[PDB]
């Protein structure tokens, strides 16, 4: 299934405050009105240059994601999971299961990094060894499909994991979600008087 990304997936490109100003920036962004894949489903998906991920949900069925390349302990992989009390992030040579669910992996070894902390939207980037996560949450009129309108994702964490990533997979607890890929685009960002991005122009759209 497919659906259309109605200006969703903009995020704060840097930690510099700006207000009442229009600023042009060149970065990996989800192009406006992009053809995004629609799931209802836990197959392995490519990561490319980065992912936009969104979930529309009511019972918190989606609990996290796994990122990596071989996903078979021959290489390191990144595990991100949100349990009932804490967000947990680990980078280990995980031997993941054929059908992970909350029983994600058979074994874990050579672990070098660990960190412990409606519509829900996320963006995942991997640049020069840094894995950056942005998100925002918002109540919306429907659970089945992606809404209209503009909103900007705030940075959530910036992990210096330093690992190669080419594929990823969603973790479910025993709902619908959307996946889009970021591309190098030039965007003109409108910052309001409160310093929040309130609109954007995808300079290569039309």
């Amino acid at each position: 299934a497919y659906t259309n990304s109605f200006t969703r997936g903009v995020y704060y490109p840097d930690k510099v405050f700006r207000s009442s100003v229009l600023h042009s920036t060149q970065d990996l962004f989800l192009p406006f009105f992009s053809n995004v894949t629609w799931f209802h489903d836990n197959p392995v998906l490519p990561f490319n240059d980065g992912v936009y991920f969104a979930s529309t949900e009511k019972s918190n069925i989606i609990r996290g994601w796994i990122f990596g390349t071989t996903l078979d302990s021959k290489t390191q992989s990144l595990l991100i999971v949100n349990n009932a009390t804490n967000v947990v992030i680990k980078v280990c040579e995980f031997q993941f299961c054929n059908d992970p669910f909350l029983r994600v992996y058979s074994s874990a070894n050579n672990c070098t990094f660990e960190y412990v902390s409606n519509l829900r939207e996320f963006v995942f980037k991997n640049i020069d060894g840094y894995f950056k996560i942005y998100s925002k949450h918002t109540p919306i009129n429907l659970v089945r499909d992606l809404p209209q309108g503009f909103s900007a994702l705030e940075p959530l964490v910036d992990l210096p994991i330093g690992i190669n990533i080419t594929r990823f997979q969603t973790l479910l607890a025993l709902a619908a979600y959307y996946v889009g890929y970021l591309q190098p685009r030039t965007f003109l960002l409108k910052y309001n008087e409160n310093g929040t991005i309130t609109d954007a122009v995808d300079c290569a759209l039309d």
Binding site: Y12, K15, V16, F17, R18, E154, P155, G195, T196
Partner: protein, 49 residues
């Protein structure tokens, strides 16, 4: 004169009304000079006119 995390300059540091989001560390001028900064110890926001 000031030196915030290496950011070195001169100005009349003043308490800022600018509503920096929790992740933001600096503010910029059109010339990309720093216009506001977050104190690395108190985390308060200061104007740099």
């Amino acid at each position: 004169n000031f030196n915030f995390n290496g950011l070195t300059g001169t100005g009349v540091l003043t308490e800022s009304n600018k509503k920096f989001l929790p992740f933001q560390q600096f503010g910029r001028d059109i010339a990309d000079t720093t216009d506001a900064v977050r104190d690395p110890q108190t985390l308060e926001i200061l104007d740099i006119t």
